[PDB]
Design an enzyme around this catalytic site. Sequence first.
Site, PDB file in Angstrom:
ATOM      1  N   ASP A  88      -3.649  24.906  43.632  1.00  0.00           N
ATOM      2  CA  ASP A  88      -3.318  23.456  43.551  1.00  0.00           C
ATOM      3  C   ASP A  88      -3.373  22.996  41.980  1.00  0.00           C
ATOM      4  O   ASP A  88      -3.856  22.010  41.514  1.00  0.00           O
ATOM      5  CB  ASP A  88      -4.177  22.688  44.205  1.00  0.00           C
ATOM      6  N   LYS A 209       1.093  23.783  51.495  1.00  0.00           N
ATOM      7  CA  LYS A 209       0.234  23.328  52.511  1.00  0.00           C
ATOM      8  C   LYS A 209       0.198  21.968  52.421  1.00  0.00           C
ATOM      9  O   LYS A 209       0.514  21.143  51.445  1.00  0.00           O
ATOM     10  CB  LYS A 209      -1.175  23.793  52.134  1.00  0.00           C
ATOM     11  N   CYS A 254     -10.670  22.024  47.647  1.00  0.00           N
ATOM     12  CA  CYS A 254      -9.650  22.940  48.137  1.00  0.00           C
ATOM     13  C   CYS A 254      -9.955  24.366  47.569  1.00  0.00           C
ATOM     14  O   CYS A 254      -9.774  25.335  48.377  1.00  0.00           O
ATOM     15  CB  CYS A 254      -8.265  22.690  47.536  1.00  0.00           C
TER      16      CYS A 254
HETATM   17  C1  LIG Z   1      -8.175  19.712  47.262  1.00  0.00           C
HETATM   18  N1  LIG Z   1      -8.674  19.909  46.039  1.00  0.00           N
HETATM   19  C2  LIG Z   1      -7.339  18.595  47.505  1.00  0.00           C
HETATM   20  C3  LIG Z   1      -5.857  18.227  48.068  1.00  0.00           C
HETATM   21  N2  LIG Z   1      -5.639  17.176  48.226  1.00  0.00           N
HETATM   22  C4  LIG Z   1      -6.971  16.521  47.697  1.00  0.00           C
HETATM   23  N3  LIG Z   1      -7.675  17.125  47.349  1.00  0.00           N
HETATM   24  C5  LIG Z   1      -8.955  16.875  46.691  1.00  0.00           C
HETATM   25  C6  LIG Z   1      -9.009  16.502  45.038  1.00  0.00           C
HETATM   26  C7  LIG Z   1      -8.177  17.058  44.436  1.00  0.00           C
HETATM   27  C8  LIG Z   1      -8.220  17.029  42.843  1.00  0.00           C
HETATM   28  C9  LIG Z   1      -9.067  16.165  42.501  1.00  0.00           C
HETATM   29  C10 LIG Z   1      -9.953  15.597  43.170  1.00  0.00           C
HETATM   30  C11 LIG Z   1     -10.041  15.775  44.613  1.00  0.00           C
END
Ligand SMILES: *C(=N)c1cncn1Cc1ccccc1
Length: 327
Positions: A88, A209, A254
Amino acid sequence: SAMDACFTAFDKDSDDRLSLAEFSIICRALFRNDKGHIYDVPPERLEQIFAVFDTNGDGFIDREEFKFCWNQWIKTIVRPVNAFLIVDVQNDFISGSLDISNCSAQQQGHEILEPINKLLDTVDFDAVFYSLDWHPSDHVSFIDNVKMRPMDESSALDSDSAKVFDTVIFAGPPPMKQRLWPRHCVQDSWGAELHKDLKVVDHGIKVYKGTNPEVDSYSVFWDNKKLSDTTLNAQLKMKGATDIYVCGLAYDVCVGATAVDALSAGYRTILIDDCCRGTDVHDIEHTKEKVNTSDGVIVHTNQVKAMAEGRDRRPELGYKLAMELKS
Ligand SMILES: *C(=N)c1cncn1Cc1ccccc1
Ligand SMILES: [Fe+2]
Ligand SMILES: [Zn+2]
């Protein structure tokens, strides 16, 4: 051939068997780095591993039992098949609607780009995967949509009191906890693109995803209810992957979810700390404890190359694999 030679060289006894003591010498040959360090294996764990390969319980590993040991344990420790999993690293989590630097821990997500690119430039991984959060506009994880779905009687907050970053509990059986986020990583949007300065290697595989409107998927493996999974695991098995190096954003959500699922799936799992940033110091430390307690390891970018090449062979990962070989 080479195998019998190894068995021969550690059969001090010369009795065509391997005692625990002779096996402990195999472990000291295996779990070391090439910077002059030999890792310490607790004697208790020593016998735990030994008993995996002493399939009858005679207190010895003979040349028939050792076949399983050589082919499925020693070979993976010395020549792991490495997948790199970049979680991500997307615009909305670095500078857009969910900039991690605006979360409580104020960590800067752009900082992971340099070490990730350097790993991509210097380590010859057997597979490289890039995950992408890939949400439809009506996704359950958005504050925007809290009114679209009936709330459970168990939930403290409803559609009228809920604010971004609150946790609500949706009805529709079964009840489902969901932390509400700003609208983020919507399909085909700028916020869902990989960061423009992230190197996308030509053999890299994108894994999407979070696509089901009704369920979130922080992990690149299973969704948050552990009902459906991506094809990541099937793709890993097709490559013969044994070891998964995980990084990206966010450390405590994540990345951590993905690392825990990889451990559940049976993989030797390595979290690259400085290639990650998180949202909350306390939840990051809880993530680390989870990985460490399930025999993953947490390492710095500068350790990865020697680990992936089999020159730094960690005993936590050797123990993980022996415990998985029980079944
Ligand atoms: C995983 N990290 C994710 C996927 N969708 C939301 N999140 C949580 C998040 C991502 C980035 C910054 C803060 C929270
Ligand atoms: Fe998301
Ligand atoms: Zn035996």
